Design a protein around this ligand. Structure first.
Ligand SMILES: COCCNC(=O)c1cncc(Br)c1
Ligand SMILES: COCCNC(=O)c1cncc(Br)c1
Ligand SMILES: COCCNC(=O)c1cncc(Br)c1
Lengths: 237, 300
């Protein structure tokens, strides 16, 4: 059924699975019209599809052209997500297809289930975790490729960079979720933390800086402080 | 006017005939039911005084044979039987008629309730759902499961209802996933109406049979089937106007007839609120919405 704290290690066993997050698929700026009404302008979006074990990120870029002439875009966005996830599974060799797909918002279950009727053997599951994947558009390199796209496009990343060479997938997911939670709660502070020391760089082929084991500890410690802090600044505690 | 004569009433039993019911005491001199209107199907049903578990009963059409009830003390129930010797039966019936040992089907002449609940119900169609072909009548009870229920365990004793599943490849055309799930007109009009029922009278017929089994025997899967068939129409943007008008009348009389104290289990809040207030046809069931709102406003 649903995925929660009690079955959290299942994410790092050897059954292929993907998280799907749709929170950046349909994105708008809201503005005033000359007549003093309000209108939206869509901007490019993305589907965040992640293998938590490997770090493989299938970033489907959703180009604004896909909304042209369409009505009820928040509901179409969910079906558009489901179509693209289904297409991706179909594109994969059978032995590479996931056994489970975990959606991060429950409104994605029915659209994905209907699109995956051909794959009765793939379980479509919700989660009770409040995962911070919406903050993936705070990662500069991901925001850039999305905003620059002129057509629909799939781009492949490893969101753990090279971390699995030194840590387990459990620890790499924990780091990712802490980084993302920090970016969501205070993007500016989070970013100031990550890029303070100019001697630490981000390799062309990576998303995050090349931190030593000890520098990651310091970084991880500062991201917690931020999250505990912003929780005080928010709740006055 | 036809007659379902009984050999005897050896066990205390509540007897249903269509929407009427009466109590018979252990070994009371009761020998059946007379004046049954020709031209409709009927259902005679049973709830023993000792064990309210297992409502059971028989769907029949008096034009298809002479039917009598005999209590079987081995199997412990009132069994429907056919008498092929038509003089032996007419003689047996006349004797009981003369001795006034039969209750009279108590149809009020103004009352079209039964006709309105059974307009599209046919005995030959019931017989291709309840499979037991050596008999012209059809047994049903509370615990019989539907073909679909067994998929999710004895097949001979199942209700072979028409399998409806909104998240199935039958319901969803490749490439129309969003379209067909949010607007079920394809599934209603092409898959179900044109290729299985053949017309809407047949769709209305299983819908009517489903409700009656759900209400008379408390059959859970019949309740599921009834709601599924309602929801498929209400969730279709494109429905012939004659079918919408007829559905409204159909449902009105089912809602009117439902016992007020059984509304609790026999009415699915989600299906009804969806059908009346959110669905494509939310404005198309005026009579049904008015009776539902005045009689069961709690449910909504
Ligand atoms: C060979 O005759 C034995 C079976 N028939 C009956 O017992 C009978 C027939 N018709 C009505 C009623 Br009540 C009883
Ligand atoms: C085609 O499947 C067998 C039942 N078909 C019907 O069309 C039908 C019609 N009226 C009542 C009932 Br109960 C079913
Ligand atoms: C507490 O009831 C759990 C099953 N629910 C039902 O609503 C139901 C059950 N059996 C028959 C019929 Br008809 C309805």
């Amino acid at each position: 059924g649903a995925m929660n704290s009690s079955n959290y290690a299942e994410l790092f066993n050897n059954d292929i699975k993907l998280f799907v997050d749709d929170t950046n698929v349909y994105r708008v700026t809201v503005h005033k019209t000359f007549e003093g009404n309000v209108a939206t302008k869509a901007i490019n979006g993305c589907i965040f599809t992640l293998n938590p074990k490997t770090g493989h990120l299938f970033l489907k870029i959703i180009h604004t052209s896909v909304w042209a002439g369409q009505k009820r875009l928040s509901q179409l966005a969910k079906w558009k997500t489901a179509e693209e996830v289904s297409a991706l599974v179909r594109s994969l060799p059978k032995e590479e297809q996931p056994k489970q797909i975990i959606v991060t918002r429950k409104a994605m279950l029915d659209p994905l289930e209907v699109h995956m009727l051909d794959f009765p053997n793939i379980a479509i599951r919700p989660t009770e975790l409040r995962l911070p994947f919406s903050a993936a558009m705070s990662i500069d390199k991901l925001s850039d490729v999305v905003m620059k796209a002129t057509e629909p496009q799939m781009v492949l990343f490893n969101i753990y960079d090279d971390w699995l060479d030194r840590i387990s997938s459990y620890t790499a997911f924990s780091r990712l979720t802490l980084l993302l939670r920090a970016l969501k709660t205070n993007e500016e502070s989070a970013k100031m933390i990550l890029l303070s020391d100019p001697t630490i760089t981000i390799k062309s082929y990576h998303l995050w800086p090349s931190f030593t084991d000890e520098q990651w500890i310091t970084i991880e410690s500062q991201m917690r402080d931020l999250i505990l802090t912003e929780y005080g600044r928010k709740y006055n505690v | 006017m036809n007659t379902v004569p009984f050999t005897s009433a050896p066990i205390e039993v509540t007897i249903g005939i269509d929407q009427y019911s009466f109590n018979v005491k252990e070994n009371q001199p009761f020998h059946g039911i007379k004046d049954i209107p020709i031209g409709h199907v009927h259902v005679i049903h049973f709830q023993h005084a000792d064990n309210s578990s297992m409502r059971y009963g028989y769907w029949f059409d008096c034009r298809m044979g002479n039917f009598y009830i005999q209590y079987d003390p081995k199997d412990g129930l009132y069994k429907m039987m056919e008498e092929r010797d038509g003089a032996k039966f007419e003689n047996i019936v006349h004797n009981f008629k003369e001795r006034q040992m039969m209750v009279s089907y108590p149809k009020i002449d103004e009352d079209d309730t039964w006709y309105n609940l059974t307009e599209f119900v046919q005995m030959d169609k019931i017989r291709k759902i309840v499979r037991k072909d050596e008999n012209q009548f059809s047994y049903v009870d509370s615990s019989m499961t539907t073909v679909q229920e067994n998929e999710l365990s004895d097949p001979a004793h199942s209700l072979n209802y028409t399998v409806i599943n909104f998240k199935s490849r039958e319901a969803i055309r490749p490439g129309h996933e969003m379209e067909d799930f949010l607007d079920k007109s394809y599934y209603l009009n092409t898959v179900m109406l044109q290729g299985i029922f053949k017309n809407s009278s047949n769709y209305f017929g299983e819908l009517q049979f489903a409700f009656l089994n759900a209400m008379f025997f408390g059959n859970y899967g019949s309740s599921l089937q009834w709601h599924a068939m309602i929801e498929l129409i209400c969730s279709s943007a494109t429905v012939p106007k004659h079918m919408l008008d007829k559905l409204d009348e159909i449902l009105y009389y089912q809602i009117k007839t439902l016992p007020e104290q059984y509304s609790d289990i026999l009415l699915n809040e989600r299906v009804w609120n969806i059908c009346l207030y959110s669905s494509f046809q939310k404005n198309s069931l005026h009579n049904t919405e008015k009776i539902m709102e005045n009689k069961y406003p709690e449910l909504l």
